[PDB]
Design a protein around this ligand. Structure first.
Ligand SMILES: Nc1nc2c(ncn2[C@@H]2O[C@H](COP(=O)(O)OP(=O)(O)OP(=O)(O)O)[C@@H](O)[C@H]2O)c(=O)[nH]1
Ligand SMILES: Nc1nc2c(ncn2[C@@H]2O[C@H](COP(=O)(O)OP(=O)(O)OP(=O)(O)O)[C@@H](O)[C@H]2O)c(=O)[nH]1
Ligand SMILES: Nc1nc2c(ncn2[C@@H]2O[C@H](COP(=O)(O)OP(=O)(O)O)[C@@H](O)[C@H]2O)c(=O)[nH]1
Ligand SMILES: [Mg+2]
Ligand SMILES: [Mg+2]
Lengths: 343, 55, 38, 442, 430, 442
């Protein structure tokens, strides 16, 4: 085929250039009938990437305010470029925001499970915020949730507001925005938290776990979080960031010469990932040992044969795609936390 | 350079002589040098270029 | 009286050998060599 | 990159209406000249540039002139639906027709109008940066098409020189006829076209009527159908300049590959999947079936039988979903056939092109929607039979000077008839000599 | 740097009404005189053409003179007529009768003193005075005689300023009056001595502009006076708006006049195009440059291809590059080198101003010093010699009081002006 | 320590706007004359003092005068964005221009305005403790720049005496031209400038247009681009007084090293890393590459070809991350080249300077950001070609007294034309004589 009048979706996009320290703006076109992408420059009307096939993309991935991985780089979709994509991509991109309170962190895994795999909300923004009383009052948090950590999630689904109200009614404790201005203020909250997040720094008894994108596509993140919490760990820190290939190389440099599938493991960390930091309130619990015992062997077949209840035996498919990456030494906690949370 | 020397009895609508120009002229109206209206004048080059630089 | 095509409207490069206003200079140099010898 | 279109006379302007309708619909330009409001995203692509130029406000305007001596057809364009598409200066019209006299167009009336036309073409050529040829549409059966087409080709050939000139020409059909004096105009026109054209495409109305009756299911066809088929052929040949593809073909490549000797430049044209929607769903349309179709005499748009001659060169353009290995397998199968013959001095007889853009469907059209199509232009000695039959009708009429007094009254010497008849005799002898085997000549 | 305008006679008053309408429109002045503009760039040079009256009002620095008040009642009745100061209208009680001698000697000397009092009152109010600008016809009666009388008096009283004139001259084909050669010859004799710069316009050129370029079906004198008002308002644009390369009337004179008698110029304005065609072609420096030298857009019947350019000036308005101007002027000089006088190394001056006229992205006005102007004077001299040998209508002029020696002097001076232009046309380096 | 800048006419004021924009952004002074509250802390510094003085409340004010006879350009600076930076007394404007007449500026109009200029320069010189020269920016093509610049330089030369005066001068381009009377003004200016200037740097707009087309990718440049490049050159030359370095260069060292004989003081200028942001990250820009770059005539900011002459002295200023060993290796490689030739009486042809501050980047600018740059000013006999074409144009125009009546009426004797033309003839003979080989005396 390769026709020029075939249906497509158009967006304006942004991508940071780490070499020139400059921001670039493009126009992205996605022909969903055959999974091909073309990119053009806004400034001088120059071609950037010829029409090429990408088999790992899908129609559900392209949403406003989302991020994609393309040839190892991260690209951000914040626009609508014509009316046709406004008609097609609308009705499934309404934005709602959900906040969580202190008393419901110990059941946060089931909260994310009911949020994602049963209420139908797919979401990429998730952070933990601690605010002073005056700023919290100004931004408009509920009064009963002041003086505590809060997790704000920016969801997207059809009929977002009414479904969010239904989610409020279904499980107690959560709060959701009831108007557009509340949504805007909570988006400001999550951006401000992104400018300076909250976590414990310099603690030798800490552990950081990353959840791979293919695990998220199967809607298994909440169950993984709940299983980690159940083992005797307290959550302190949450984030949703997109990491590029250079960041993956810098994070995984000590492994160069250990893993037998290093470039394939590097590719598995591209996309949207969740970041979890765990600490223990008892000095008699070593977080790294229990985290690694729960995670299991890094080879999914060995994990299935020997430790059938492990996370990797539950959600792994191959050595490169083992659904979790966790710290393996007793000194890596501060380094991982500094990498993932220091501004 | 010569002047027109033909007498046109008919009106615009009959395809003789200058019907196209007659139709356009009766469509628009009076004659002005200006093409567009209600547009602000651009600023000078010095004002546009030498602005307050970013800190 | 023609302005020519658009693609030939650009700046011609300067070549001082073919500049019509510098011919006496080159003639002066060509005389100057023999003047120096004598 | 760019191409300029010159339309002369009635057939050429009417075929131009269908051509520009098709090029607009393929690029997506609206009849007013602007892209649709729900499709303007801020940036676009250069493919239109071959046929349109933008002013800067985003209106598109086409690289064409319409030339006629009678006002009616151009006044229909000025008052029709595409009024806003064309620039008004491009539509040039005289006061009175050439009355089926080549002499009247060439000597009496066209001499006054030709200099304004040359000024318009010059004004177009100055606003280009990669002009690569002229496309000309005219009929040689009528007076103004023959006379003014010849005069304008002569002036263009002196002023622009090396630039290529490709002609699409409607010749007099072998039994369908419209005017009595057609043989005289066609002989004297053909004399001028021999010296001043690089490739000449031959068309016969009787072939396009037969093709529309047999393949399509139309019992009562009219000129709009023929003009839409011609527009499809021109779109297929020019697609190589406008869209991405595996094997592109520039207009200079046609002349190098198709013309063996400087006089042997008359080519036959054919198109494969002319098919209706009801037949299209009963049949698959693979590469090998349409490749076999273009060589059958039922597919041609000119009334000649290629079985009475030998092919010298073929240029095959595939557009749509085709893969090069299938084109190679098809061409290898054609070479095996015994009813297809090539001159022994042309061992590599084929040129291929592969483009991804499938053929466009026009809202009121009669062609079905198909995933692939192939168009062929070929040089063959069979065309000598077409000239001989016009020459026979000329000989019958000229033996009694049946209408000559009109031509001599409008300014022509009687000697010009004998010169043109001798030039066509020499062209027939060239096609006889070029086809003689070297094995018999040793 | 303030200009004082003088409009004399029917043609002058009619052209003046449209000029002051165009100037009031660009600076946003209502016909009541109130400023209603929308940018400070408009206010910062309002002084150049307007004086400020109390409580907001602006008044235009112009003197209106005529021998019969019919035209003045028509201009006072016009849509912008109210802006003019009532004390600035000076009129007599009997017409010029199309006779130069009446306008110069009998009613001229009677009214001229009141005009000089008004012109001095207007001049001495300026903080710094720039040149005068005068519009009149040479073929008429009060325009030629009283205009040249006033020009002579102002040159006596202000010899260090600039004197600039816009003048209408009789067509060779469209005559409106039988005695045109006498009035034209005497007026040209006065102008060549008194004037610093003189622009000439043929009504035939404005008709050809309207019919060929604008394709107007039924043009009227309002259209011709609008084209003239547009070009008149364009030459002063660099005096009253900012720009990358400022220019001035004195700088134009210094670059245009090689010798003091050679001060007669051709005029042109470039962005002219019909309402049907305008959607088909965008403005750009090559298009304006191509139209600017096309003789179709030049306002006199003589054609440049029969002569040579001594000097030329182009004033550009709009946001545009200087490189394209320089390279265009070089390209036109190099390809058409035979039409430029060879003993001047560069004949074109360019100037660039940031603010274009309203409704146009860019515009240029062209002033040209070309030897083909000699053809107009030769035609007037032939018709004069045909009429003078037979004393065809001379008794009117002699009855007013003129001596015959003035006619022979004026004829000799015009013949010498034609000879001097012809000599510079055929000059060579040797 | 201190330097005073004198800007005359339109080119000099517009180039001044770009220069002061750059000096503000490099030191960090805001357009209102202050500095941010956090930029005061740190080590105690004063490097700005060469160009700014503080009142004590912390406002900065610059050591410059802007001179013009027409108000428009100075009213534009007075109403622009930098209104609070300049002292209102510093912006001096007359009522009317010199109308491209050197005579009008020198005799009639500049004599009234000159005493205010001298009073302002005196007021600046009293507020200094280490004045080390005057910098002058003007164009010799216009009337007020030539006439008032000459008259003011004569008066300054009498009052201040030995203090150095370095000029940046815009000369008429060899084929791009703006006014008819340019030859007369340039000759008459150059006659006065010969006696009263220590080094004169020549610039031509045609060279900067060529440089902006070839290296940067700008199709339609305007004066702001040229003025920003000139500002970069001035910043490079004055950086040696303001920042630390391995080999410093005081303003007196240029005059001592570049001028062999008191009339031979005209120097050529060029700048190396003129590059666009998109090209800069694909290539390294080592010392040897930019050193090789400064010698091609395509890199020069004056339209002359140095291959037709011999160099007498070169001064190379390096700023940024450069190490002396690379400068020595580069200069030895240049010395090896066969297309670079020095007069045999100048064996030790080079002076070097090395400064640590890299060039600043301006927000609206078109140059990329780079870690190192080199700027060169050099004295060469090729400059004699520039005077010869102006002198030929003067001879062509003066043979018929083409415009002389303006000059004689505005107050100048006809004798002054012959005197200036004879002085320029002697300067041409000086450049002819100095370039004569000393070899073969026996
Ligand atoms: N296919 C096709 N053939 C046409 C068309 N119009 C005319 N013809 C044929 O072309 C021949 C007539 O040529 P014309 O175009 O009418 O001649 P002309 O150019 O008008 O010359 P004048 O009669 O002198 O004005 C006949 O054989 C017609 O059948 C058309 O629109 N399509
Ligand atoms: N590079 C550069 N050249 C300029 C600039 N402004 C003017 N010029 C050039 O300098 C010459 C004009 O000199 P002006 O400065 O306008 O003359 P002037 O000093 O104003 O003299 P008067 O006209 O009598 O007031 C022309 O060659 C212009 O191209 C500028 O900002 N940058
Ligand atoms: N272009 C133009 N010409 C005019 C106008 N009014 C009169 N004329 C011409 O000027 C001449 C008549 O001169 P006129 O003004 O009556 O002379 P006066 O009697 O001395 O004022 C004739 O050639 C008229 O055609 C006008 O409004 N515009
Ligand atoms: Mg016809
Ligand atoms: Mg000036």
């Amino acid at each position: 085929a390769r026709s020029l009048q075939d249906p497509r979706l158009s967006f304006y996009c942004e991508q940071y250039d780490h070499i020139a320290h400059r921001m670039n703006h493009y126009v992205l076109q996605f022909y969903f009938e055959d999974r091909t992408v073309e990119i053009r420059e806004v400034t001088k009307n120059r071609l950037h990437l010829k029409r090429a096939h990408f088999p790992h993309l899908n129609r559900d991935d392209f949403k406003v305010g989302s991020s994609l991985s393309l040839l190892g780089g991260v690209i951000k979709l914040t626009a609508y470029a014509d009316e046709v994509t406004r008609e097609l991509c609308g009705e499934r991109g309404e934005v709602t925001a959900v906040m969580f309170g202190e008393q419901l962190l110990p059941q946060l895994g089931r909260c994310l499970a009911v949020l994602t795999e049963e209420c139908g909300f797919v979401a990429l923004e998730m952070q933990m915020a601690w605010l002073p009383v005056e700023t919290a009052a100004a931004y408009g948090v509920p009064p009963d949730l002041v003086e505590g950590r809060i997790v704000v999630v920016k969801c997207a689904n059809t009929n977002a507001l009414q479904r969010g109200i239904d989610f409020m009614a279904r499980m107690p404790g959560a709060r959701a925005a009831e108007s557009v201005e509340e949504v805007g203020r909570w988006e400001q909250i999550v951006e401000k938290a992104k400018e300076q997040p909250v976590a414990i720094l310099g603690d030798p008894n800490s552990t950081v776990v990353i959840i791979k994108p293919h695990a998220l596509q199967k809607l298994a993140g909440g169950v993984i979080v709940q299983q980690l919490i159940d083992a005797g760990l307290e959550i302190s820190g949450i984030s949703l960031t997109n990491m590029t290939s250079q960041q993956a190389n810098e994070l995984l440099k000590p492994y160069k010469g250990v893993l037998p599938d290093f470039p394939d493991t590097m590719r598995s960390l591209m996309g949207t990932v969740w970041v979890l930091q765990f600490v223990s309130l008892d000095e008699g619990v070593d977080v790294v040992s229990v985290a690694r015992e729960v995670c299991g062997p890094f080879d999914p077949v060995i994990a299935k044969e020997l430790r059938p209840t492990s996370i990797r035996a539950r959600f792994g498919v191959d050595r490169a795609h083992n659904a979790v990456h966790c710290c393996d030494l007793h000194e890596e906690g501060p380094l991982y936390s500094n990498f993932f949370f220091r501004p | 350079r010569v002047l027109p020397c033909f007498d046109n009895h008919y009106n615009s609508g009959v395809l003789v002589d200058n019907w196209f120009d007659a139709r356009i002229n009766e469509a628009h109206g009076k004659f002005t040098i200006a093409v567009d209206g209600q547009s602000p004048l651009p600023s000078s080059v010095y004002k546009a270029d030498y602005s307050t630089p970013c800190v | 009286f023609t302005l020519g095509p658009l693609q030939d409207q650009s700046l011609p490069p300067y070549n001082d050998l073919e500049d019509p206003y510098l011919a006496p200079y080159w003639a002066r140099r060509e005389m100057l060599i023999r003047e120096t010898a004598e | 990159r760019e191409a300029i279109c010159i339309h002369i006379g009635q057939a050429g302007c009417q075929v131009g209406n269908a051509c520009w309708e098709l090029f607009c619909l393929e690029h997506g330009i609206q009849p007013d000249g602007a892209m649709p409001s729900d499709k303007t995203i801020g940036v676009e692509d250069d493919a239109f540039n071959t046929f349109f130029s933008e002013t800067g406000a985003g209106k598109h305007v086409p690289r064409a002139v319409f030339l006629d001596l009678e006002p009616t057809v151009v006044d229909e364009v000025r008052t029709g639906t595409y009024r806003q598409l064309f620039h008004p200066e491009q539509l040039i019209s005289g006061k009175e027709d050439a009355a089926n006299n080549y002499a009247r167009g060439h000597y009496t009336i066209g001499k006054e109008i030709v200099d304004l036309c040359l000024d318009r073409i010059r004004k177009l050529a100055d606003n280009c940066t990669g002009l690569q040829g002229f496309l000309v549409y005219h009929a040689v059966g009528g007076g103004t098409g023959s006379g003014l087409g010849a005069l304008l080709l002569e002036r263009l050939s002196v002023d622009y020189g090396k630039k290529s000139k490709l002609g699409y020409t409607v010749y007099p059909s072998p039994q369908v006829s419209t005017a009595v004096v057609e043989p005289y105009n066609s002989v004297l026109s053909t004399h001028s076209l021999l010296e001043h054209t690089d490739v000449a495409a031959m068309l016969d109305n009787e072939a396009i009527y037969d093709l529309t009756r047999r393949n399509l299911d139309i019992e009562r066809p009219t000129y709009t159908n023929l003009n839409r088929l011609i527009g499809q052929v021109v779109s297929s040949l020019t697609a190589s300049l406008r869209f991405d593809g595996a094997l592109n073909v520039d207009l200079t490549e046609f002349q190098t590959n198709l013309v063996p000797y400087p006089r042997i430049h008359f080519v036959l044209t054919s198109y494969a999947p002319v098919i209706s929607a009801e037949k299209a769903y009963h049949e698959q349309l693979s590469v090998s079936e349409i490749s076999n179709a273009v060589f059958e005499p039922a597919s041609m748009m000119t009334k000649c039988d290629p079985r009475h001659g030998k092919y010298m060169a073929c240029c095959l353009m595939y557009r749509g979903d085709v893969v090069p290995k299938d084109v190679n397998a098809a061409v290898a199968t054609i070479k095996t056939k015994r009813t297809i013959q090539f001159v022994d001095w042309s061992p590599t007889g084929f040129k291929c092109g592969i483009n991804y853009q499938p053929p466009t469907v026009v809202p009121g059209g009669d062609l079905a929607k198909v995933q692939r199509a192939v168009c062929m232009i070929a040089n063959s000695t069979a065309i000598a039979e077409v000239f001989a039959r016009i020459d026979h009708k000329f000989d019958l009429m000229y033996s009694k000077r049946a209408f000559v007094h009109w031509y001599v009254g409008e300014g022509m010497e009687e000697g010009e008839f004998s010169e043109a008849r001798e030039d066509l005799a020499a062209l027939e002898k060239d096609y006889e000599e070029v086809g003689a085997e070297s094995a018999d000549m040793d | 740097r303030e200009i004082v305008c003088v409009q004399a006679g029917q043609c002058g008053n009619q052209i003046g009404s449209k000029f002051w309408e165009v100037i009031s429109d660009e600076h946003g002045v209502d016909p009541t005189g109130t400023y209603q503009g929308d940018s400070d760039l408009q206010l910062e040079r309002i002084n150049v053409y307007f004086d400020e009256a109390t409580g907001g009002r602006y008044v235009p620095r112009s003197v209106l003179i005529d021998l019969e008040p019919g035209t003045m009642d028509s201009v006072r009745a016009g849509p912008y007529g109210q802006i003019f100061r009532p004390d600035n209208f000076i009129f007599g009680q009997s017409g010029a009768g199309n006779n130069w001698a009446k306008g110069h000697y009998t009613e001229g000397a009677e009214l001229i003193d009141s005009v000089l009092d008004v012109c001095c009152k207007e001049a001495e109010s300026c903080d710094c005075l720039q040149g005068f600008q005068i519009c009149h016809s040479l073929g008429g009666g009060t325009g030629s005689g009283m205009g040249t009388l006033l020009i002579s008096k102002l040159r006596e009283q202000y010899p260090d300023r600039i004197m600039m004139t816009f003048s209408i001259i009789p067509s060779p084909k469209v005559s409106d009056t039988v005695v045109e050669p006498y009035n034209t010859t005497l007026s040209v004799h006065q102008l060549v001595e008194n004037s610093d710069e003189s622009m000439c316009i043929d009504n035939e050129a404005l008709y050809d502009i309207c019919f060929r370029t604008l394709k107007l079906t039924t043009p009227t004198f309002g259209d011709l006076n609008h084209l003239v008002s547009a070009v008149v308002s364009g030459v002063t644009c660099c005096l009253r708006f900012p720009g990358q390369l400022n220019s001035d009337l004195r700088k134009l004179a210094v670059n245009l006049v090689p010798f003091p008698r050679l001060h007669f110029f051709m005029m042109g304005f470039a962005p002219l195009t019909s309402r049907g065609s305008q959607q088909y072609r965008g403005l750009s420096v090559p298009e304006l440059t191509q139209q600017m030298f096309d003789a179709k857009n030049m306002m006199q019947a003589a054609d440049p291809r029969h002569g040579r350019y001594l000097t030329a000036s182009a004033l550009f308005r709009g946001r545009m590059s200087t490189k394209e101007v320089d390279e265009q002027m070089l390209n036109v000089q190099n390809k058409n080198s035979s039409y430029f006088i060879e003993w001047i190394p560069n004949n074109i001056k360019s100037s660039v101003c940031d603010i274009p006229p309203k409704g146009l992205k860019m515009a240029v006005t062209f002033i040209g010093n070309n030897t083909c102007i000699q053809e107009m004077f030769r035609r007037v001299g032939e018709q004069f010699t045909l009429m003078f040998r037979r004393k065809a209508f001379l008794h009117w002029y002699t009855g007013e009081g003129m001596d015959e020696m003035e006619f022979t002097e004026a004829e000799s001076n015009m013949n010498d002006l034609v000879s001097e232009y012809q000599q510079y046309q055929d000059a060579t380096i040797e």
